[model samples]
Target: ARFSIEGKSLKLDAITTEDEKSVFAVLLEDDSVKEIVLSGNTIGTEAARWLSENIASKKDLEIAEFSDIFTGRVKDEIPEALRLLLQALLKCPKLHTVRLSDNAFGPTAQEPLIDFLSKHTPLEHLYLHNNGLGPQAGAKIARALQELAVNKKAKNAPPLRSIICGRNRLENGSMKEWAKTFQSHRLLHTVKMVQNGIRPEGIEHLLLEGLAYCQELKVLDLQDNTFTHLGSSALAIALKSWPNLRELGLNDCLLSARGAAAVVDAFSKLENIGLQTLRLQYNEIELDAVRTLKTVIDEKMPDLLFLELNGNRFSEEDDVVDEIREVFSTRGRGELDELDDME
Candidate 1:
């Protein structure tokens, strides 16, 4: 039973099936263990069941990471295993963070996840990125969250703060439901929907109308989608509503010069913008667009800690790029690395 504890986090990674049982047994006895990192472990159905039965009732258990726990398992058992695990998680009263990413929880796992979310209202952070949840499953999950939000019983629902559902196939089919879910939940602070195949119409529903309700939003990541000028214009108009926004990611979303200009124009109109991190990488933005944005960033958002503008159409000899880079450098802020230097 190999495990390391730092403060309240208990990281139990790379444990075998036999060691998983031992670790869970010890975990059940440990009172100080608040966050459990059980990812990268090869736990079978029996061990998963045992852990769920024992740890589900723990009121103090706040964070749980079960990513890749069923490594090399048979296809038929994966869904069943997830079902048992989520069913157990429903009993956790204080569980706020759950990272179930890379578990391949496709359409089959939707029912159990929805059931778990319907009961587990204390969840604040849900990281289901790369779970293979397509449009249908995504809609189901969104509907479940919407139900939880409007539940008349205040004690049965907890305010969701973040939902990181990147790398899913939630295209136009599920965006409407997701928009409704976002509109209903006003307490959401962070939303990452990178590479979800959301088109311009979906973006309008999400950013223009739905996100207006989330005035408390701090971080918004809509990278790797298909947003053109229409979505960008909507986003520009919608920026005023997010006064508490600290980080904004719009990388690789087809934001051309016109789209980028709209964003910069909106930045100039913003009152007291609290943005610290801005990601505009691979958006087809030209030097003129960069220059426009630089002026606004200098005047409005001077406290920016990180600025990513990689994979744009700026040449090495372009003085605009250097000027933009120097703006952040002179302010004692972070560096503006080039496209080749970025990840």
Candidate 2:
């Protein structure tokens, strides 16, 4: 479903007003070009206008990769430029996946994005990383997507499947909206929200109130977030929901020694025997917890392809670490991630 064009390396030297029309017009001439990957270059307003018009003409335009598309553009030009491009997307009937990563759509400029986001009914995957959306804008984004879910429910459209919103500064301020956002889109398979200043309660809301309903969930990457109290325990409780889960990323999440134990206990009961990847780095996990985790991995998660034990409370040569490594080798899956930052 992809005849895609992207980058200075592929076709155009740069994405400017003069260059985009001539370059992208050729690509958009045939309607089968489903994906437009403008991720590797930047675009100004007029450049955006030409592309928007071309995109407006295409009925097959589906996946859009606009990451890092506004590096040097002025703040004022951004909103209007984004508005035109996103509004143009309304013309495409089958549009689904959209990646708008690494753009600075802060509170001042996220209105058009948020507005356009609300109207997207065919959405399945929405990736918005490092967009600099602070709490208010992030909450607004959540609400807009939540509205999209409500619209899907009304239209009998398919549920949104994945959301990757890393490094977006969506703190506890947006917790409620995000929870509703996840709750409304109950079929979500992958939810990666890392480095978003959320504490235990906010994280708990996302897990218990929202993501638990995502019965088809496969991957949950909440790396670089804080989860000492209820959040860690919340995940333990929430683990009962995602039996289809394949990967769980909890790196740098500061899950305390006790919290680590809670997760291991949950894993012991985790019905997802096909789990492949698990990251527990920098969680202040002690040796006992690692040993317990090893037991769970050996007993339950036999398909484990990658496991992270770095930055925890165990020694480098602890028997648990060596034993876990050999178990991976026996399973024919290679080395665990380097065990650094050990206590």
Candidate 3:
């Protein structure tokens, strides 16, 4: 009768106890344990083989959380551990969600991870963060992902829904492969790639060539990345394609005055605007962009509730600030967020 194996952050090494109540055999009790979590602990190849057998026996498995499980374990034991577990999960048909973040699965275990992702095609959500995936590994994974997307399209299968790969330092070297990967999965909804050391050209290619194809895009968060005026110029054109746009987070994106102006002008020309939260904090936007942005709010994105304009070059007591406050006042609500970060 069990559906999920709930053993998260338990420092679990073995899937058993002194009393001989093995967590692995819960499937024997009911055969319905579709989801498993062994996060925040240490595991060995010896212990992982048992769990793989348990997971491989499942018929209709879905969510699997294998995050941060190798916290100070020997390096030689992880590849076998990863291969055994990922192969087991591959036996599942309805498997969708996969979380394998926070582990330093660098080159030692990248082969198994690459093969697992390459062979699988039914995934909807994939989280791979801080795994020490350098640019070459990222290229391998992106190539695998691109192949998987191709295979899925050939099978007439459902496309991917969300992709959260942050802090992996997927620099400009691998950005092109990632763009191709994103382009292949045309129905993605959420894309959060923060702190990846991406440059302006990489950002431009990602938006102008890759993510521009996702017509169903809703939430986009690209914080802590370099998006100079060249990148935002590409973003200005890409913003027009997604009519289902919602929350847009560009904090610390370095969208200089011209970049901010281009983005503000893009919003003014949108055919449809469903934006709720527009975060452009710390972008060096001057008073000129702020003046036009006030009009963009009053005329275009009237339904927006939160506008984060801190860390810009505008003064708090400027006339445009008053105008922005008035625009939100007509929406039957309060005012803008705190502007304490203005330069």
Candidate 4:
């Protein structure tokens, strides 16, 4: 028997084919339901299959909220049939955007989905927020991204712009390899790798060895990882040569006042480096480091749009937080044309 959706709203849940028909009936009459927000819904494989079929038939569809139904820490324990249905949902061509927040698509599911992305060309945006996508899965996706960036065959490759892999374990050696791939591949525009195990050493290798080759990187998020003062120094050296790096996020890392001072000192010299946004929230730096950073920002790097250094563990006597706020507040007030006049 052919599948039929004849009477109910797509948002409504159906127990049987008859109920499905009832929902479909409503959808048929109202094709104006272009955007579907399925947040916190327990619609299983059958529902996903039906939804996928309907979405594929439509020319233009936008799925805004596609959070996984599994609320607890058991999203990874999805049944086999339901897994197949989810896969089918991914195959839908008309899908413009997908939100899979808190859904743990482990290595098994992630690898295949990445392969599918290589073949599929219509998807534009993907959000995998707080998903337990480890290094292996991240690497697979990164490899595919490398291909998309370089493959001439994918000239029409749908611009896979924003990827939010925050709070996942895509750091250390994995990030290093990914950096190399992107450097060689030369296509991706932005990458967010927050809350991973990436320290200054990883960043140095990835940048100097891997990312230095790719001059197209614009946005890079590296907050809440492990980067010490030594790591910061390494990063400072690396940033000297990264001409296209614009956005940087470095929150809650193991950076000291000395490390922050080193970065500031280095930024003073690299005039060609294009860093537009700098987020250093929740870091460890004293008043002196904050003063140094402020001086550097005032003397150089005057084009930043967002600069966050909230949540750093500093001394009450130091009054570093106030100093940071004051300096940032009055950063663009005066002229420092002669600051970069040195050799």
Candidate 5:
């Protein structure tokens, strides 16, 4: 087996199909491995089934990452492989982190994935980015999360804390299911859904009905979507829900002056705001909105540490820009720099 064991982690990246079978055999006799990273490998249905049977009994397993495991000609087998892997993961009582990004799990694989997630109760961090999960698949996944959260047995409950599903095409059709999940599972503290095609109506369901239940959320990333005035207003009104929010990302969301004004007004009225990072880069905000945002940052959100407003319509020589920069500089906060928009 072309694998290495460093501390308690098993690193088996870029292993051959034959090596995958050998590694599973080796893992059957080994119990010291607590973390497994088998990314960039091509594992077919048989190998995945073998891995499932062997790894399911590892009581100490805490983290498992299998991102981009299927490559080239073996891509057609990912559905079955992922199904077996997730079935095995359901038995891992101590597993809190699972990364399955870039696997391309389309409609065919959604049912098994959702079924496995519904039973994996101890999960805390789930990263399913770039999986091609359109609205239908996204809705199914959200339903699984809701089912796990509403399970009557406390032991069967899911304590999901972080959900990063960026690059998935979860449009308005999936928003209701996601909102339902969020409404039932308030333990989530971090949610990153960048480039999901979410519109104003989806934002309304999320902020008005869902996020209000997530009072402990710290990091809310909704970048690279399509948000207009209505969505911004919904977010503004729901600002009070996240009293402990530390980071907010609204970059490239089609936000204009009106949306920016509403957000600034909300910030001015919010009490005990603990925001430290505010990213509004690559939007349609202008000088007037910048002035309002600057005022709120200077007076209300005194604890603000990082503010990203680049890629908007504001010159470096503008007085409001200079004043905002000076304000952050005077507060011992680091210099503000323009962040490139993610592709």
Candidate 6:
């Protein structure tokens, strides 16, 4: 059987049954087609079974794609099609970097996935975005991560970095647990929990208890959530602990003038914490907030690299960009990328 090849590469466009069998046959013969992208299709259990068998027999393989879309599926009951993919992942010991974005790997499905990860430490970099993961799923994944980080039983482990649990229903408690796990452990880095329903009071405890511990975390994305002035203030306190903190994404996080001011104040107290990237796009910051932020910029924003402040009206003031640019160019320390209005 023959497989169709796409443009500019020998990549398989769509895998027919014959194509699947042929791919496995080739791997069996030459052992080369280990890394593959099977995106933009609905791979059923049968296809997943074949792939799993092939991968289980092989030594090293990396498979990442979004073949199915389960947008509004319930938490407990996962589609049989995607369950096959999860089961396949459990078998492949050499598999690393699985990107199942926009799929519905909600709390129910996440339990099994977490259980699998707790035992198998080969897989790293799991991206399960747009999955309806609330506190229950977050806590489960957090517990696994904590075990992976601290459990001496799991020796020589490649840490689970870059967990993209974004656009879910993660509250402050969930965020707290996730962040607190990294406080003592130096493994888990780069957490993106944006657009989750993080409340203000919860944010306070999250920062004080949870975030204050993750001193090695680099990227902290809190975009499109419900963080207000008090929440931003809490974040400021948390920032004081992470001197190596790099990226901070706070896009459309319901920030007002006072919230922006609080962040600027945080920069002052935690002058050691170098912010390589600061994203505040689509927020409620105004001219006054910009001026407040400019204070840090004027004092030579030490590790400040890229500053994004798009999608804000700010009382019809066009000088927002001009102010950020002027401060960043003259008094700022590092680079400044383009301003985007993206959500």
Q: What is each predicted model's overall lDDT from 0 to 1?
A: 0.78, 0.83, 0.83, 0.59, 0.79, 0.63
Worst window of 10 by summed lDDT in candidate 5: 1-10
Which parts of model 4 are misplaced by more than 4 Å?
A: 1-34, 62-65, 72-96, 147-155, 210-214, 240-246, 272-276, 311-343
Kindly list the per-residue Cα lDDT of model 6 for residues 1-343, writing each as its tens digit: 1111212122322346667565545644544445655554444445555555654554555554542333333434454545555666666666667776666675556755666556556656767666666777766777776665554335665666666777767776576676565554554467776767877776677667766776677887877777788888888778877777789888788766678778777786655556778888776776766666766665646667777766654533456556667765675455444545423
Model 1: per-residue Cα lDDT over 224-259, one tens digit each? 997788888989888998999999999889877788
lDDT of 6 at 142: 72
Candidate 4 lDDT over residue span 165-204, tens digit each: 6776777757765775556455446666678676667766
Cα-based TM-score, every candidate: 0.89, 0.93, 0.92, 0.74, 0.90, 0.79
Clashes in predicted model 3: 0
lDDT of 2 by residue, 269-310 (tens): 976577888998999989998889888888888788988888
Q: Give me the displacement of residue 42 in model 6, in angstroms.
A: 1.0
Flag regions of model 2 displaced more than 4 Å. Answer: 1-5, 9-22
TM-score of 5: 0.90
Give one digit per residue, the lDDT tens place, for model 3 in 1-343.
3344444444445555541265444654555767777786677776787777877777778888888888886665689888988999988878888889888876879989998898778788898988878788888888899988877888776788888887888878888898899888889998888888888998999898888998899989888889999989999999988889898889989989999999999999995598888999999899999999888888888568888889899989899998888877777753688898789
RMSD values, in order shown: 3.9, 2.6, 2.2, 7.1, 3.9, 4.9
Please report the TM-score between candidate 4 and the true structure. Answer: 0.74
Where in model 3 is the C-alpha error above 4 Å? Answer: 1-13, 16-28, 333-335
Clashes of each: 0, 0, 0, 10, 0, 1
Candidate number achieving the greatest TM-score relative to the actual structure = 2
